Amino acid sequence: REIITLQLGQCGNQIGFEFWKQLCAEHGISPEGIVEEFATDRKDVFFYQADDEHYIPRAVLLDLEPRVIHSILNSPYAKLYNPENIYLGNNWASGFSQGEKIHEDIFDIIDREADGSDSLEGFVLCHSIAGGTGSGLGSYLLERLNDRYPKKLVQTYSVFPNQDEDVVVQPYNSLLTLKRLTQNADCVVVLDNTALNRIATDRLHIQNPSFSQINQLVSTIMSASTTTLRYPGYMNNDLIGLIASLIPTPRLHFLMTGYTPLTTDKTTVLDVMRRLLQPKNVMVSTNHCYIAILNIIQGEVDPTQVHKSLQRIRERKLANFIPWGPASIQVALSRKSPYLPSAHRVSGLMMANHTSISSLFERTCRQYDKLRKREAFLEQFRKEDMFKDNFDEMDTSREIVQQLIDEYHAATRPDYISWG
Amino acid sequence: REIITLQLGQCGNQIGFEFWKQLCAEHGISPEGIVEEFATDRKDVFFYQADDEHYIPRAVLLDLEPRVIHSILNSPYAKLYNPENIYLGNNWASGFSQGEKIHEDIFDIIDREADGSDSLEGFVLCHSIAGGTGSGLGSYLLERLNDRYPKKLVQTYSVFPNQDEDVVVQPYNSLLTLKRLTQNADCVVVLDNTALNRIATDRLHIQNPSFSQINQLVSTIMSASTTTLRYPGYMNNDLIGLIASLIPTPRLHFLMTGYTPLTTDKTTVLDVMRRLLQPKNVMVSTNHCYIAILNIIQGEVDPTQVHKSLQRIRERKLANFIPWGPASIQVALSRKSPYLPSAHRVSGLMMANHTSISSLFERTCRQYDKLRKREAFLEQFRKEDMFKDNFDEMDTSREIVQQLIDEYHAATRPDYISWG
Amino acid sequence: RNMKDFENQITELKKENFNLKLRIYFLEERMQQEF
Amino acid sequence: RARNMKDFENQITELKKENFNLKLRIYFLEE
Amino acid sequence: KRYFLMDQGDFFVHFMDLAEEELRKPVEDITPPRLEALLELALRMSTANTDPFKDDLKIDLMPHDLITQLALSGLEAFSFDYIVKWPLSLIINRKALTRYQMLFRHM
Amino acid sequence: RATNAQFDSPEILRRLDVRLLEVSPGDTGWDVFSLDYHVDGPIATVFTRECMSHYLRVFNF
Secondary structure (H helix, E strand, C coil): CEEEEEEECHHHHHHHHHHHHHHHHHCCCCCCCECCCCCCCCHHHCEEECCCCEEEECEEEECCCCHHHHHHHCCCCCCCCCCCCCCCCCCHHHHHHHHHCCHHHHCCHHHHCHHHCCCEEEEEEEEECCCCCCCCHHHHHHHHHHHHCCCCEEEEEEEECCCCCCCCCHHHHHHHHHHHHHHHCCEEEEEEHHHHHHHHHHHCCCCCCCCHHHHHHHHHHHHHHHHHHHCCCCCCCCHHHHHHCCCCCCCCCCCEEEECCCCCCCCCCCCHHHHHCCHHHECCCCCCCEEEEEEEEECCCCCCHHHHHHHHHHHCCCCCCCCCCCCEEEEEECCCCCCCCCCCCCEEEEEEEEHHHHHHHHHHHHHHHHHHHCCCCCCCCHHHHHCCCCCHHHHHHHHHHHHHHHHHHHHHCCCCCCCC | CEEEEEEEHHHHHHHHHHHHHHHHHHCCCCCCCECCCCCCCCCCCCEEECCCCEEEECCEEECCCCCCHHHHHHCHHHCCCCCCCEECCCCHHHHHHHHHHHHHHHHCHHHHHHHCCCCEEEEEEEEECCCCCCCCHHHHHHHHHHHHCCCCCEEEEEEECCCCCCCCCHHHHHHHHHHHHHHCCCCEEEEEHHHHHHHHHHHCCCCCCCCHHHHHHHHHHHHHHHHHHHCCCCCCCCHHHHHHHHCCCHHHCEEECEECCCCCCCCCCCHHHHHHHCCCCCCCCCCCCEEECCEEEECCCCCCCHHHHHHHHHHHCCCCCCCCCCCCCCEEEECCCCCCCCCCCCEEEECCEECCCHHHHHHHHHHHHHHHCCCCCCCCCCCCCCCCCCCHHHHHHHHHHHHHHHHHHHHHCCCCCCCC | CCCCCHHHHHHHHHHHHHHHHHHHHHHHHHHHHHC | CCCCCCCHHHHHHHHHHHHHHHHHHHHHHCC | CCCCCCCCCCCHHHHHHHHHHCCCCCCCCCCHHHHHHHHHHHHHHCHHHHCHHHCCCCEEECCCCCCCCCCCCCCCCEEECCCCCCCCCCCCCHHHHHHHHHHHHHC | CCCHHHHCCHHHHHHCCCEECCCCCCCCHHHHEECCCCCCCHHHHCCCHHHHHHHHHHHHC
16 A cells, blocks of 8 residues: 655754655656656556645655754745645743643544545654754654554664764754654664764765765665665565565564665666675764665676575675574565666665664764763753653663663574563 | 785885886776777786776875975876875884874775785785885784784885995884784895996986886886786786795795896896896895895796796806705796887796895894994984883894894704704 | 485486476377377 | 587587477376 | 566556455455456556457456365456467467466466 | 785675585595585687586596
C-alpha cells in the first residue's frame, strides 16, 4: 500500500519541504500537481491521486508558530503539497504541549487526511531531534500515533543536534525525544549534522555554513532513500519489505545513510561499494558492527559480478561486521528517476543500522547529564513547569537511553538475550 | 605488494627529485602521471592506478629545513607524486629529535602510500648522510619502520657527503648514522660523494655544481637499479631479489654502487662486467677484496655469450677474489625503454660488497678522531648535553664503526664468525 | 570434487539421460501403436 | 589418466539441463 | 518478463493488496471472472497498467502445487497466459509456455 | 586483472585457464596448479597432443 509523510521543527519542515521539492523535481510532476509531464514512475506510492489528476504530495507540515512556515509556503510549489493542513516556543515541553492543546486538528489530521489515501501502509516523519518547536511536538505525535494506527508503519528520518562545540536546552530536548523515538517508532533514520559537514569539507571547504549545505544532501538523499520505492525493479519497491530487511529488534532500529559520490548535485560493482563502506563516506562522527547494510547499484548494472563482488569485499576485508547473528547486506539493482539528467551515473547508496550510534547517544546523554546535575538549565518555562513539575520526566528519558547505549553494545556482543 | 620509498633530508630529496624526473623521462608515464606517451610493462610495484588515470608513484619526500620545500610542493612533479607525501636541523641531534617529535605523522604517510597501492612490500630510504635533516631524521624514522614492518626490507641508500673538504659536521653526522647503517638498517647502498664528484666532473669537465652533478650520476644509477621494479621477468621482478646475493654477511651490508657507462648522458658483453670492476666505478677515492659480485644487465645485450664474460674474469681476477667465499654473478637481464634520450644502452650495474670502501670508513674515522680529540667543529648549539650526556651512544657508534673496519677485513678470514 | 569419481558421476548423467530417452522412446512407440 | 576438469564441470551440465527439461515436457505428455 | 519473470515489482503489491478474499477460501470455489477483474484492476491502479499486451494477457488456473516435479486460490493455483496466435505459435507457444509458467510459479 | 599485461588481447587472456595436474599419493599445491589450455579450432593442428603433453609435463618442473 501507499505511504504518508510528516515534517516537524523549523529545520524538519525545511528539510521535509526541500525533500518534497526535489522529489517533485525528479518525477514527472507539474508544479500544480498534474501528472502531465513528458520528463514511467508510480507517483501513487507517495503522491495522492485527486480528480484533476492532482498527484498531491502527502505532506503534513508541523511547525510551532508561523515564522518559518509561510516563507516555506511561498514557492513555485505552493499548489502541489496541498492536504489543507497548514496550521501553526523553543523548548520540548512547549513543542509537546502547545501541539497537544490543539490535537483536534494538528494531530487528528492523522485521520482527517487519511482521505488522502485509498488505504495507508503508514507514516514517514521528518523530525528535528532538539528543534525547539519540533522536538516535543514529534514525540506526542509519535506516542499517540501508536494508539491511532498500531496496525501500520511509523518511520522517522531524524536530524541529530551536534555542532562541533551551543544551545542550553538542546541536550535536554534531544534526549527527551530519543526515549519516545526508540520505544514508539518503527525505524529512526538518524542524520548526523557533524558528519554531513565532514562530507561537505571533504567535498570542498564549507564547515562554517553548517546546515544549509546539509539541506542539499538531505533533500537529495531523502529522495534517493525513497527512489527505491518509486521506480520499478524486481524487489524492494515496497517500504514495508525494504525496511523489514534491516531491523532485527524492536527498539534498536536506528538506520544511518552513506553515499559514494561526495558531489551529489566506469567503476565496477566490485568497487563502488568499496568506496561506500569507508569511514569518510558514511554519515557518522572499538568492537562495533552494522546490524544491516542495504546498498544500491546503478550505472554498471552488471547482473553477475555481484555474487563475486562481496567476495572481493571479503578478500581485502573492508566492512567488518558480525553481531550475535547474521547481519543482512543486500545489493539492490536500481533505476534513474525519469525527470533527471544522468550526472554521476555510476553511483551507490547505503542504509545501515550502525551500532556506533551509541556513541552519539552517549554524547547527548552526557550533555544532558552535566546540565541536569548543575540544575541551572531547566529554563523555568511554564509548559516545562506544568507538564513536568519536579523535572523527574527529564530523568525518565535518561533511564531508557542510558540503558540503550549499553543495549547497542550488548546487541554488538554475541549474547544480547542477556538484555542490557 | 609494492616497495614504498622514503626520500629524506635535503641531500636525499635532491637526488630524489632528480630521480623522479629521470624515471619519468624514460618510463611509460606522462609528465602529469597519466598513461599517455606515444599512445605493456610492470608499473604496479612502483606506480599504481588512481581514479583520474594518474599512476601514483611510491614517493615520500621529507626534511626539516623548508629552505625550498615549497617548490617541491607546487611543482608539476607533485602531480606525479599525488599522495601529498611531503612533511616539514643540520646537526644529527636536532634532525633526530625533530624526527622524534614528528614520528607518528610521518609513519602515517605509509597508509597514504598504501591507499596509492594494493599493499605493503617494505621500504627504501634515499637517506641523507652528513645532512642533519636526513642524517638524523632518517635514523629516527628507520628506528620506527623496522620494528613495525619487520617482514620486509627497510633499506637505506646512503648518499655520503665525504668530499675531501658542504658542512663541517660531516664526521659526527656520518658516525651517528653509522650505528644505524650497521645495525638499524638492513641494506646500505653506499655512495662516496668524493668519488661521485670526481667521476661526474669526468663525464664532462664542468666542476661547478658540487651536488647537482652528483645527482646526475645518482639518478641514472637509481633508474638502472629500479628496472627490476619497473620491468617484468621470469627472474628479477623486485628490488630485494637484486640486492640479495650482494650482501655477503648480515651487518656488512655496505653495498658500493658500480656502473659501466657513467657517461651514458654499446659496451660489449665482456665489458659490461670487465669495465664494472675497475677504478672508474670502484667508488672510493691494504687488503681490498670484493666480498660478493652480481649485476643487472640492460639494453640490447647478447643474452647467451654472457657465459664467456665471467670466464674472462676467471683469468683477470679483477674482483680481487680472495674473500671468505664466492657469492658470484647471477646474470639478470632487462629491456631498455623507447622514447628516452638514448646513449650507451648496452650496459651493466652492480651494488657489490668491496673491502675498498673500508678506506672511506677509515677516512671518516680519521676526520672524526682529529676533531673529537680536540672537541673541535661541533655545531656547539646549547641543545645537546640534554639527550646524550656522557656521549655513550657516540662511543657505541665509534666502536661499531671500528667493528665495521674489522668486519670488512674479517670478510676474508677462513671463518667469518671469527671476531676482530 | 574428487575427479576420480567423475567416472561414476558422468556415467550416471550418461545413463540417466540415456534411460530417459529410451524410456520416452518406449512410451512414444506405445503412443504410435495405440493410435 | 588425465581429464581437463573443465570438461567435467560442463559435461554434467549439458546432460543435466535437457534431462529435467525433457522430464518437465513429459509430465504434460502423460495426459 | 514483466509479469512471469516479475520485472514489474510494482504489479503484485496491488494483487496482494486486493486478492486476500481469494487467497484463503476452501476447495472448488474457483471464480475466474473475479480473477480476470482482479488482474484488470491490479493492472490499472499500478504502473502495471501501461503495457499494450496486458490485454493479450489473461488469468488461467494451475491444478498442481509444484508437485509436477519428479479454490485454495492463487497460492497453489495461479497462472497467466499471453495468448497464442497461430502465426506466432512457431516461436512463442502454449506447449512451450507450460515450462515458462513453472518458473513464474516459483518466483 | 590488476597486472599491466591487461593490455594483452582478450583472446589470449581467455586462452589461459586453471586446473589440477596429475596426482600422486603425496602432493602439494605448488606441484598441482597448472593451465589446462584448450586448443580447439584450426590451431589444433598448429599445437598438437604430443607437444601440449610434453609442455605440460615440463610445466610442473
